[PDB]
Symmetry: C5
Subunit: 310 residues, 5 copies
């Protein structure tokens, strides 16, 4: 018959979310409660009712007693898991109480950047039993699992936390137990507002002010340099994300600014060609369309993306 293994996972800290590598790092405590009647013991008066063991000697005790422990893996773990504590408390009954304090990076494969920077992401930790459900069954250790209240993350804000149990078939034919700690997080837009939206909007607004100088050459030089600035912002954005196979809301926003700036160069080349061919009066009359086109083009663009993505 199978023995119930009580799994509990609590994230104390978010040491960082690295969206370029699609992983996240936490400081966490894993807690297990497992009753093995074979490990039960008798004690003399004065002698303790609870035996405390370093994992090393407790595993060495299990091998001796020919007992199989609920060997588990953090399925989505990455690199080195640095351990703080690996302590066992064994009661007279045979109840094993295990605590595992660690720092570790975990794969974040649920990353969907299509709406970046207005995106919401799913982050999880998968705890799998190496042995199948006929031997060990994972149960939810109540009153422990979740996320702490001093996570240390400033950009991300955790919207909800969940725990559930499911099956996996990684090393076995038959179903094997899997404990899941899941959390959803959305982004604080302040960085994007201050470093990307406000600057891009300023460059566009103060560039439009110069249309009132009525110097077509000067607009051409301005739109040309503006195009270079947007290409530079395009590199600034791309450095935050992985080399995705798909278009971002931000990517569509930058391609939009490229198109409008390209047309600004084209139109003002045409108005200055009119001036060069002794048609200054005509270019000046058409200039009202060029001056009111600019704000309408960027405002039409903003409504196009907002529709295309929402």
């Amino acid at each position: 018959e199978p023995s119930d293994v009580f799994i509990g996972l609590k994230i104390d800290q978010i040491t960082g979310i690295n969206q370029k590598e699609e992983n996240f790092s936490v400081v966490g405590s894993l807690r297990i409660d497992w009753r093995q009647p074979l490990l039960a013991f008798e004690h003399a008066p004065g002698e303790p009712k609870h035996r405390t063991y370093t994992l090393a000697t407790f595993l060495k005790l299990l091998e001796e007693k020919q007992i199989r422990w609920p060997a588990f893996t953090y399925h989505n773990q990455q690199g080195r898991m640095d351990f703080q504590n690996r302590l066992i408390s064994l009661s007279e009954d045979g109840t094993v109480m295990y605590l595992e304090r660690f720092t570790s990076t975990f794969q974040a494969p649920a990353f969907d950047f299509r709406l970046f920077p207005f995106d919401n992401q799913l982050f999880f930790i998968h705890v799998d039993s190496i042995f199948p459900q006929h031997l060990f069954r994972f149960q939810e250790m109540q009153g422990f699992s979740g996320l702490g209240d001093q996570l240390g993350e400033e950009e991300w804000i955790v919207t909800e936390v969940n725990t559930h149990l499911t099956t996996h078939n990684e090393f076995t034919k038959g179903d094997a137990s899997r404990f899941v700690l899941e959390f959803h997080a959305e982004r604080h837009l302040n960085y994007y507002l201050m470093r990307i939206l406000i600057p891009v909007l300023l460059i566009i607004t103060v560039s439009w002010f110069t249309f009132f100088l009525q110097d077509y050459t000067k607009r051409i030089d301005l739109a040309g340099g503006n195009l270079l600035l947007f290409i530079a912002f395009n590199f600034t954005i791309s450095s935050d994300l992985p080399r995705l196979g798909y278009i971002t809301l931000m990517d569509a926003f930058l391609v939009g600014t490229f198109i409008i700036t390209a047309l600004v160069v084209l139109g003002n080349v045409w108005l200055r060609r009119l001036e060069n061919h002794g048609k200054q009066a005509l270019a000046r009359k058409l200039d009202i369309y060029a001056i009111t086109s600019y704000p309408l083009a960027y405002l039409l663009g903003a409504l196009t993306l907002w529709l295309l993505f929402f």
Copy 2:
């Protein structure tokens, strides 16, 4: 009844404060004095009264004698704690004297950048007992805890150090002992003065000198390029800090320079529009307002932030 565990923590070095990741790194010595009568021993004349042990064999001795050690965790630790020394001296009485020399990063979750770079921050190390207060009670080891006199930090300056004891309920239902080493540090502003204030002030002051050329086009070109430089400083500042969800004193300062520069472009476009419409005499008379507005706008802005933040 509970046994008194004497905790002492001394920070020898500050290997660095990383404000982008909100953590700090220290070289420290942890000192514990714990009397366990069960560990007492007899000795013959001439034979030593003090037994020296490597943690490995001392823990192996505790497991043998069925003794529970005051298992502790550095609650706010991050990653790998690289150890230099883990040495035990056991007296005939049963007094365990433990020394733990390490290099380690700790979470700095008390980071408040709202007044950056004129900010004061709290840094701490939390030492928690895994076992509750009915088993072990942490006491303050006197004459040891604090911060050394060659910390190696150049930007930060420690204002005060404190040690105290409190309860925690991390793994238990009932209260458990927690030792706290806290320190407050303020920043040396010289870097910000030399690399950010002086340059930004120079760009503004030498740009104002060119107002005396009375060339409105030249002011427009200068304010436009100045706006680009401020956007670049905006990125230089943002790279020092995390992607905060809130506004910095520095952020307000940069947004301010954007607004004033935006208006400088707008005003000088208007003066040059006057010159283009055969109203050069009028633009020249108004120019006194444009020339005296510039210094007043930046000086009014500086007094607005200084009021809004203090």
Copy 3:
């Protein structure tokens, strides 16, 4: 006679492909099935039919029993192999079932950048037996080897996976067993399209718009600065790749833009030299060739590379 060693390798995650260092990193599970009759055991009723061991004690058991284990090496491994699990299950029969869960970087020496960014690459993991084929023979553990379906890689897309067995002669005179897990991957061009092709095409197209202004000096200034932008893109590309001893498709593409831009400066210098020598009418007539040359030169260049590389 030689004993069959059943090798199985499964890649769960691609933590990254680093093309500058020509290596890749995976999270993988190694599975071995090996029957050693010498390890067989008798059991009493109630006592388990399968003994579970930590690698440490199982190797200690092999040394005791004077048994030689199929010692292996990951031939193309690099640096530290961080291990998650190293577990042995020994059946009454003497069937050793070994599981090795790890994170590791592996050399990618098959890297051919000649067609970058339209390149397809071979990535493999080599598992070698230290002892020759007279002692141990590697066999393919069926229904396990391959690559998972949540690899976490965004730029690369795996086209096919293969497993095969071959000989090696690394430490021995005679042939020794080698297990091979191979995979082919092609690149998602979206990053190159969005950050390199679209910008380079825009700079070229909007620069051509200005030819309609008929200002030869302005074209010279524009082509000069365009040349600097392409040199900057040249550095942006070179930072992604190693310092190769051969020419890339991308390198040929950039050298092409340098040549065309060089000639644009040369031609427009000539047209402006005509204007300076009172031959404005002649320069204006020739200008049709200069205006239609530009698009044809870049379109002729694109067909030249596309032929020279395909």
Copy 4:
């Protein structure tokens, strides 16, 4: 009575000096000679007169024999000390010969950047006895301590090496032994000459050549851009050093170039204001002062810093 512990430290390599973090890294060999009569042994003919032990088993032998070893700490060490060799050779007499080969970073708290880049710095390694002087006394192991002849450091040049013994009171009430290996190193100025002095001098000299064009507007544009270049060099310099609370010779040098460039903008604004107000003859006569002021200002500045710092 106290036993003499012979300490010897030899630095084979300087893996790097990181002045931003104020630390340095070495590959070194620690050598200890300690006679413990209790460890003495008898040997049979043919049996060795010197017993060789891995530190692990030698410490295990000391615990058994109830002997206290001279437990030491590298006081100024930082992070992980990677070990190559930890070997003990025990003679029939009881003379312990210990060798410790390691790679490690050490705190450099003696860093004085006030004269950078013409600075000389003190680097040391502190080896402390955990037990006081009544138990163990450190002595200087003769003919071993120092620095090798293939250190691998290219920027720094070691001027002298010293060894001495002093007391410390880190974990004890009474004085405890401390071994010191100290070295002084000065900087090779070639990098600063080639990448900072020559460029800054060229920008200044070739900018002065343009004064002979007698175009005041052109000088204003040149000095404005020069000011931006110096702000960029200011960032290039600041990236090499920590965020110091004090002024560098280099910082004074850059602030100087800012002031002179600021005045160049101011003066040439004035000369062009004269030209604009029909006083070109006056501006042209005063221009001799503006042309000879420039070289004298930078040469007067250089003599001011050279006095203020030496």
Copy 5:
């Protein structure tokens, strides 16, 4: 008498050459054959003639039998040596066969950048015996030592590999054995050709095209900005190398472009001063010298360095 220790070292991979830190990283296999008659053993018929050991238990066996192993050090090693395999096979005779598979960085102190990028460098691995030549003598294990055929290095090309034996006196009075694996490597110039020579040559050639416009002011502006580009290339080059105390061929090349560009500014200032003083005809006649000087100056410079360095 001394026992022959057969050393063999094979480099499988070059994980990288870091010329800024003057070190290199390899994946290598160390092989030792050492006959110790004391380790010989008896076996019954059917029982194995070869005993296979994990280094841990084999060293524990040597300590037990009171045998001294040929303790060695990788003299030029740096940081952590990550081990893949540490396996011993002991024959009935007492022949120890040891295999050490590792990833490690080694100091490269033979680095001579004086002719960079046309430089050839020496790279080596030093394997030293801790015990002197009276105890152990290193011999060359034949048919193993060298470098593999899938090194994975793209920039460097290995010209030759050598193995030899020499003495060292690191920890002893008398000579001690040292095994040497040496290799020479030259650089693939393609990176330098594509990213540094072609761009610098283009900037120079297309800048010369504009001399045919006969606008002295425009040449001054072009040479001024060219000087800034060369200062930027000067930083791009310096970032690849350590902060050397000597001049590079590349450094001489950049200082040369600074001088020629400085003179271009000077000459064209003079020609424009002639035009300003109503001597346009004279400046136009002298212009032939200025136009033909430019190509001759750079071609004379290139022949000067090529002579000064070869």
